[PDB]
C-alpha cells in the first residue's frame, strides 16, 4: 500500500501535466486554423 | 506538426491513465482478497 | 489519412478504458456494500 | 478543422475519464482505511 | 458516499456523450477524406 | 467476481494492443512530417 500510494501520486501528477500541455497545444492549434 | 504533437500528448495521457487504472485494479483485488 | 487513422485508434483506446472504469466502479460498489 | 475539433473531443473525454479515475481512487482509499 | 454516487453518475453520462460525439466526428472526418 | 476477472483481463489486453498500435502509428506520422 505504501508503494501504491506513491505511484498513485506520481501518475496523478503526470496526467495533470499532460492534460495541461494538451490544453495549451489545443488552443495553439485552434489559433493556427485562422 | 502541431496536430501530430497533440496526438502524442493525447496518447501519453491515455498511457498514464492506463497505469492509474491498473493501480485501481490492484487495489480492488487486494481489498477483495482481504474480505472475501 | 494517418492522422485520421490515429484518431480512430485513440478513440478506441478511450472506449476500452471506459469499459475498464465501469468495471472498477462495480467492484468498488460491491466492496462498499460488504464493508460499511 | 474537423481534425482539430476531434482532438478537442478526445481531450474532453480524457478529462472526464480523469474525474472518474479520481473518484475511484477516493473510494478505494475509503475502503482501505476501514479494512486496514 | 452519497456525493460519490452522484458524481459517478454525472461523469459516466458525460463520457458516454463525448464518446458519441467523437464517433460521429470520426465518421464525418473519414467521409471528408474520401 | 469470476466474470469480473474475465472482463478485466479482456479489456486490459485490448487496451494494450490499441496502445501499441497507436504507438506505431505515432512513429509513422512523425516520420511523414519530414
Numbering used by the authors:
A (entry chain A), E (entry chain D), F (entry chain C): 628 to 661
B (entry chain B), C (entry chain N), D (entry chain E): 546 to 581
Task: Give passages from the manuscript.
Human immunodeficiency virus type 1 (HIV-1) entry into target cells is mediated by its viral envelope (Env) glycoprotein, which is initially synthesized as a fusion-inactive precursor polypeptide (gp160) and then cleaved into the non-covalently surface subunit gp120 and transmembrane subunit gp41. The sequence structure of gp41 is defined with multiple functional domains, including the fusion peptide (FP), FP proximal polar region (FPPR), N-terminal heptad repeat (NHR), loop region, C-terminal heptad repeat (CHR), membrane proximal external region (MPER), transmembrane domain (TM), and cytoplasmic tail (CT). Firstly, the FP of gp41 is inserted into the cell membrane, leading an extended prehairpin state that transiently bridges the cell and viral membranes; then, three CHR helices fold in an antiparallel orientation into the trimeric NHR coiled coil grooves, resulting in a six-helix bundle (6-HB) structure that pulls the two membranes in apposition for fusion. Two hydrophobic pockets in the C-terminal portion of the NHR helices play important roles for the stability of 6-HB, thus being considered ideal target sites for anti-HIV agents.
